[PDB]
Structure 1
Amino acid sequence: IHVSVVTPDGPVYEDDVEMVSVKAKSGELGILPGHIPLVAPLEISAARLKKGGKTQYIAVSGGF
């Protein structure tokens, strides 16, 4: 899958990872490749992307 953190200013990361997971305003959530078309707002919290063993954290604000 391709994950792309997009700001109104410009694109931030825009690469491919293994399994991205972030916490929504309802609660925790994880995304495996091949997920259902899903829509959830985010809270002010980081987004972990799990590039192998790296787990590069991206802190979103506002967020969707």
Structure 2
Amino acid sequence: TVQVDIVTPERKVFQGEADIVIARGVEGELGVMAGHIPLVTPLKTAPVRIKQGDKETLIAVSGGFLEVRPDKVNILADTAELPEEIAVEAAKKAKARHETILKRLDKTDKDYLRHKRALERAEVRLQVANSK
């Protein structure tokens, strides 16, 4: 196994030894196990899946990056939540807000990236909430 920490600026979200850490990198899906080469990569706003034998745990991560060592695996992100600690109604209202604004906006715009990233944060929070 390898020790894994999923952390935000304000708190530690996940702590434990994992068999494999499945994270969606900007270039592709990483499958980080023990004895991996030292690596740093940005992550897409997506669920981070941690397998501890029989147990699977999804963490909704947005605006984060991965830092691998052979000894340790770190994920620092803007937001990270386990299924139980996600506000579901807030995510639905956030989804409906940002998606309806985004529909009347081209890519050449000041506020396009802000709404699209906020929409991705909302949808990933809903995906991880439904797994519970």
TM-score where L is the length of structure 1: 0.92
Q: CA deviation at 1:21?
A: 1.4
Mapped pair 1:19 → 2:40: no
Aligned sequence identity (%):
45
Runs of 4+ in 1 over 6 A off after TM superposition: none
Q: How many residues align?
A: 64
Please tell me the root mean square deviation across aligned C-alpha atoms, in Å: 0.8
In the aligned structure 1, how far is the partner of 2:38 from the partner of 2:15?
19
C-alpha displacement of 1:16: 1.1
Unaligned runs of 5+ in 2: 66-132
Could you tell me which residue of structure 1 aligns to residue 32 of structure 2?
Answer: 31
TM-score (structure 2 length as normaliser): 0.47
Mind listing any 5+ residue stretches in structure 1 that lack a counterpart?
A: none
Determine which structure has greater relative contact order: mean sequence separation of CA pairs < 8 Å that are 6+ residues apart, divided by chain length: 1
Greater Cα radius of gyration, structure 1 or 2 = 2
Hey, which of these two has a bigger chunk of helix by percent? Answer: 2
